[PDB]
């Protein structure tokens, strides 16, 4: 959910468009990603896991499992694999628009609120 969101619906952040020059610009959406990090069988991992994939347990009924627990889960393949849970992250991302009315889906890494102090790397390249 929006819980502890520090952007708000129609604030005006900073952000690069594609052509590299910061702009002054719109919050027109935003929306919350909840990811579980895990740890398979076959010695990689991900950070990005969809919490319904778990198959031993319902993790959208009863929430999320406890860190360090074994799991099984159904990957992309089809297939069936064991993993340890690790943690539970929820982000939140924005869609923002421009003056000349085009759009970008940013990471909350990506914007800068107009009262946080812009490294000199923004601050040169910001536009009137």
């Not at 952007?7 to 952040?13: A, E, F, K, P």
């Not at 610009?25 to 990811?35: F, K, L, N, P, W």
């Not at 069988?41 to 994939?53: A, K, V, W």
């Not at 000349?100 to 009137?128: A, C, M, N």
Request: aromatic content about 10%.
């Amino acid at each position: 959910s929006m819980l502890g969101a520090d952007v708000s619906l129609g604030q005006v952040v900073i952000t690069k468009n594609r052509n590299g020059l910061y702009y002054r610009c719109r919050v027109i959406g935003a929306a919350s990603q909840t990811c579980y990090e895990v740890n398979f069988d076959d010695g990689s991992y991900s950070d990005n896991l969809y919490p319904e994939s778990i198959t031993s347990r319902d993790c959208v009924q009863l929430g999320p499992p406890s860190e360090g627990e074994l799991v099984e889960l159904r990957w992309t393949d089809g297939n069936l694999y064991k993993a340890k849970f690790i943690s539970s992250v929820t982000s939140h991302i924005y869609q923002v628009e421009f003056e000349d009315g085009s759009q970008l889906t940013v990471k909350r890494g990506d914007i800068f609120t107009l009262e946080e102090e812009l490294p000199k790397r923004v601050r040169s390249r910001l536009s009137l």
